[PDB]
């Protein structure tokens, strides 16, 4: 016999994948998904995904297993920085913006968004951070915007040589190559069998 409790609604997976606008990488949005049924079939009929790679679970088996505290976070990067969203990877995003733990149990989903997140003359609403004092620990959001001191001269007075603004914008233009077009990334993270389950999916 199989017993699962009483749950009403169907999880906001359409709400996080189909939205009007996403958030920048330096300020990635985070949504808590709980007390619903997680049918992972609305994911497949969405887009021809550029990358659907799952760590710790196999992509067909997520219906007939379940878990707790599933987390959904989203941001927008370019073409060549998709490979940086992985455990044990280094780079500008991976060390300064968004760091994944080495032992990661989840899935990474990315697809092209050149038609939406790009405009003629450049779309300057998607930023990413270049400079910090040190690296970034996993699952930390760094929103603070203060001037980074690159030279020996202490630049207290703001906006001078060798004291730089910490945020640079992505320049998205529709006629770019595939390596520099925007890509919407959604990363799912959950924990497998060490806590009581709160989301499971198909009841029987």
């Amino acid at each position, epitope marked *: 016999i199989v017993r699962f409790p009483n749950i009403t609604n169907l999880c906001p997976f359409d709400e996080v994948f189909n939205a009007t606008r996403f958030a920048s990488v330096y300020a990635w949005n985070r949504k808590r998904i709980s007390n619903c049924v997680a049918d992972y079939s609305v994911l497949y009929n969405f887009a021809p995904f550029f990358a659907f790679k799952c760590y710790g679970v196999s992509p067909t088996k997520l219906n007939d297993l379940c878990f707790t505290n599933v987390y959904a976070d989203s941001f927008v990067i370019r073409g060549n920085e998709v490979s940086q969203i992985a455990p044990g990877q280094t780079g500008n995003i991976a060390d300064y913006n968004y760091k994944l733990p080495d032992d990661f149990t989840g899935c990474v989903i990315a697809w092209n968004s050149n038609k939406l997140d790009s405009k003629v*003359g450049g779309n300057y609403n998607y930023r990413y951070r270049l400079f910090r004092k040190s690296n970034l620990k996993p699952f930390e959001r760094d929103i603070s915007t203060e001037i980074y001191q690159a030279g020996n001269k202490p630049c207290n007075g703001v*906006a001078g*040589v060798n004291c730089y603004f910490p945020l*640079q914008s*992505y*320049g998205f233009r529709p006629t*770019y*190559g595939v390596g*520099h077009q925007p890509y919407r990334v959604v990363v799912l993270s959950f924990e497998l069998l060490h806590a009581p389950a709160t989301v499971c999916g198909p009841k029987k």
Partner: nanobody
Amino acid sequence: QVQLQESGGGLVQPGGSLRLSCTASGIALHTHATGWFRQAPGKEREGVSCISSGDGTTYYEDSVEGRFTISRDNAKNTVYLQMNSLKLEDTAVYYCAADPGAVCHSGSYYYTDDDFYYRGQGTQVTVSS
């Protein structure tokens, strides 16, 4: 508050040479891509050169190949245009501009379409007398 400031120009005799300098206050180079454009009296503006963000692939126009060079020094945060063998129709005003990303010739794009986000005041060169 990001200003791009230029130094150079003057009265140069044909066969001469200058070194134009563009300095960035707020932003940093080797992350942006800076380029030089020029305006002649009664004419429209045209590109001169481009350098990309990392390392730097140098792109030159059909009028100034083999004569001009572009070079970026990230210690003083300066970009430099060495102009050599100046002929008489090079009398123009020169602007330096910066744009985020490896902007010039990515895909089916090229920097002659002037849409750079940062601009400058400009310096006048005069090749005559």
